[PDB]
Amino acid sequence: PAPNTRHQEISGNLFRIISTFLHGNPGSGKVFSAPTDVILSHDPLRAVEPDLVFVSKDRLSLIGEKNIEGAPDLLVEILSEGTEKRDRREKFALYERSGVPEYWIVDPDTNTVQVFRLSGNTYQSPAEFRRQDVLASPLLPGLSIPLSEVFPS
Amino acid sequence: PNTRHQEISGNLFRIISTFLHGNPGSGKVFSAPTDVILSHDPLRAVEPDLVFVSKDRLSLIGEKNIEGAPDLLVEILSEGTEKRDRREKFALYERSGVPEYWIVDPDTNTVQVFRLSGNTYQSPAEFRRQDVLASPLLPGLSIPLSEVFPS
Ligand SMILES: [Cl-]
Ligand SMILES: [Mg+2]
């Protein structure tokens, strides 16, 4: 089945804020929402379907006709109710070894977001954002994401 | 779908969702993947590229999916769609009473707009890239199709 409806409203909130910002500041990259395929490797095949994918201006060439080919700048994952610890670990490990520079884990069930940022070859310790916090990334310098706008009441 | 398809979907979602955020009490918009259940026996479940639910119809939105005909359904033509698939979605939305149905063609940068009158859709209104797309379901919202179809 598709994700639940609140999962999709959280996703569209996030996409709305990031896409609005990119549109008013042309030349800052593009954002895509699921379903958008990201090919991190062809053999053994690792194709993922993140909820949101951001590609910086200097990486636009990753955007192929059919899918995104390589590690995007920011991947966003929204936890569903049927996610097991091993699924969280094996996505975190895949994005780390592919060198995805920033990874957001959004948890609808606790209204929190964990941010991981790559430093060298490994992710730094997660920074945690609660619903009352404002989320920002150096990848999107001039963007403030109030998480009260992301997590519906 | 291909990346230009998703860019088009995102462009439409950006415009509609921004409008609804700035005009609270006007409904909610969902993007794929969002399940819409138009029939339970026999089961007929679609994943439209975009789904709009008016404020009065927000009870259609359950925990898992949307049960019933939303006010607006947006389908973006993909290259792999078969004739029976396009025919049967049109027929399914028409008999379910979906009030407005947009078919977005990325290959011609056009949108075809069907609105329900009685039991049947009227003749379609065709919008080109140089036009403003709008719907009485969203009074006050201009969707310039030059911001929807990338150059
Ligand atoms: Cl479908
Ligand atoms: Mg989507």
Side-chain angles (χ1 to χ4, degrees):
Chain A
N4 65 72
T5 58
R6 187 168 185 270
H7 179 296
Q8 279 311 89
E9 184 165 17
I10 289 164
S11 178
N13 288 341
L14 277 170
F15 182 92
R16 166 180 73 70
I17 293 163
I18 292 166
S19 67
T20 291
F21 169 80
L22 298 172
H23 173 73
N25 300 285
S28 292
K30 289 175 181 188
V31 49
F32 296 86
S33 61
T36 294
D37 292 318
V38 175
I39 310 295
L40 296 179
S41 86
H42 288 266
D43 195 18
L45 181 48
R46 312 169 207 179
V48 307
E49 192 191 313
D51 291 286
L52 293 99
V53 183
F54 164 68
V55 185
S56 71
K57 189 197 183 193
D58 288 334
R59 296 276 168 177
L60 291 193
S61 73
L62 298 181
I63 311 183
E65 181 209 336
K66 276 188 172 177
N67 51 29
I68 294 182
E69 309 149 338
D73 287 271
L74 165 72
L75 295 186
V76 181
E77 288 294 350
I78 306 174
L79 299 178
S80 59
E81 295 174 13
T83 62
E84 312 173 16
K85 183 172 170 64
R86 60 180 165 171
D87 290 319
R88 296 185 59 165
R89 291 283 301 183
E90 285 153 26
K91 277 213 170 176
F92 175 91
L94 170 59
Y95 295 168
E96 198 184 45
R97 75 172 154 263
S98 293
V100 172
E102 195 167 333
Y103 176 35
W104 298 356
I105 303 185
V106 176
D107 182 3
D109 286 289
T110 61
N111 294 347
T112 67
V113 173
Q114 283 192 354
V115 180
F116 299 83
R117 298 193 164 91
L118 193 67
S119 173
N121 293 323
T122 60
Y123 284 131
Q124 290 283 138
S125 281
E128 166 158 336
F129 296 82
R130 313 261 205 180
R131 185 170 190 267
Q132 64 262 40
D133 300 319
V134 173
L135 170 57
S137 170
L139 282 169
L140 304 150
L143 176 61
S144 273
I145 303 183
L147 296 181
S148 50
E149 297 195 19
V150 173
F151 294 114
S153 304
Chain B
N2 66 32
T3 64
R4 189 170 182 263
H5 176 136
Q6 281 307 93
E7 181 159 12
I8 289 174
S9 191
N11 289 335
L12 291 161
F13 187 89
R14 180 183 55 79
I15 298 170
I16 299 173
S17 80
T18 295
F19 177 79
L20 302 175
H21 180 67
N23 299 263
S26 305
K28 287 179 182 181
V29 56
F30 294 90
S31 65
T34 298
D35 281 329
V36 170
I37 314 303
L38 292 176
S39 264
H40 294 85
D41 190 73
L43 179 63
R44 292 246 48 194
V46 290
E47 294 185 24
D49 293 286
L50 285 80
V51 175
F52 164 73
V53 188
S54 64
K55 191 266 179 183
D56 40 290
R57 294 284 283 185
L58 292 178
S59 64
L60 301 190
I61 306 163
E63 181 199 26
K64 277 185 186 178
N65 54 43
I66 305 175
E67 286 198 359
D71 296 81
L72 175 70
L73 292 188
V74 181
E75 293 292 355
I76 298 169
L77 297 179
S78 318
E79 188 79 347
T81 184
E82 307 183 28
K83 186 181 172 184
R84 52 189 179 170
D85 289 328
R86 307 178 66 258
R87 264 275 199 284
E88 285 163 26
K89 264 192 165 155
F90 182 91
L92 174 67
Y93 296 170
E94 184 183 73
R95 72 173 171 266
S96 300
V98 180
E100 191 160 339
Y101 173 31
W102 298 352
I103 302 168
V104 185
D105 187 6
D107 291 328
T108 59
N109 297 335
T110 64
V111 177
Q112 275 202 331
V113 173
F114 303 78
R115 300 192 169 88
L116 197 76
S117 186
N119 283 288
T120 47
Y121 284 130
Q122 301 286 94
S123 279
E126 191 160 338
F127 293 80
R128 303 175 295 181
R129 188 175 185 269
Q130 58 260 30
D131 300 329
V132 164
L133 172 66
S135 154
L137 306 171
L138 307 167
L141 177 55
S142 258
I143 314 190
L145 293 187
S146 57
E147 299 186 15
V148 175
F149 299 106
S151 278

